[PDB]
Design a protein around this ligand. Structure first.
Ligand SMILES: CC1(C)Cc2c(-c3ccccc3)c(-c3ccc(Cl)cc3)c(CC(=O)O)n2C1
Length: 121
């Protein structure tokens, strides 16, 4: 759920999910349209697609367990949905960390009309 995801992001990047990643670019936030603005926005695009492969699950509210094994994120065994949700989030946290160097404040609170184009999962 958003509770585990936010904790994961904070630990990984040092940034608070809200408002660092909740209204960033075209995909980090509600829905998404157009072409991702940068690497960080691409992370959210892929994350959005990852959740999209889980029709019957509820990523926003289903809680999973995870632990750190010397920095590494390890998803604990739970329900099938919980395991898959955790893997989606873990990937996003790592992706955000790998692209922290290009994170740009000009993409915070990005205007909707500037999101134009198409990109399929
Ligand atoms: C789909 C959203 C646009 C709606 C939403 C909430 C949200 C919260 C409450 C009620 C409605 C929506 C939170 C969110 C919430 C709380 C924390 Cl601690 C972190 C992130 C996040 C960031 C994320 O995890 O992707 N989002 C993205």
């Amino acid at each position: 759920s958003l509770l585990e995801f936010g904790k994961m992001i904070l630990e990984e990047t040092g940034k608070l999910a809200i408002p660092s990643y909740s209204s960033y670019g075209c995909y980090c936030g509600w829905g998404g349209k157009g072409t991702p603005k940068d690497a960080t926005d691409r992370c959210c695009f892929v994350h959005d697609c990852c959740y999209g492969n889980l029709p019957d699950c509820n990523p926003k509210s289903d809680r999973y367990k995870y632990k750190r094994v010397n920095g590494a994120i390890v998803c604990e065994k739970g329900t099938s949905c919980e395991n898959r949700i955790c893997e989606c989030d873990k990937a996003a946290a790592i992706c955000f960390r790998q692209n922290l160097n290009t994170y740009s404040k000009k993409y915070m609170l990005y205007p909707d009309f500037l999101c134009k184009g198409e990109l399929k999962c």
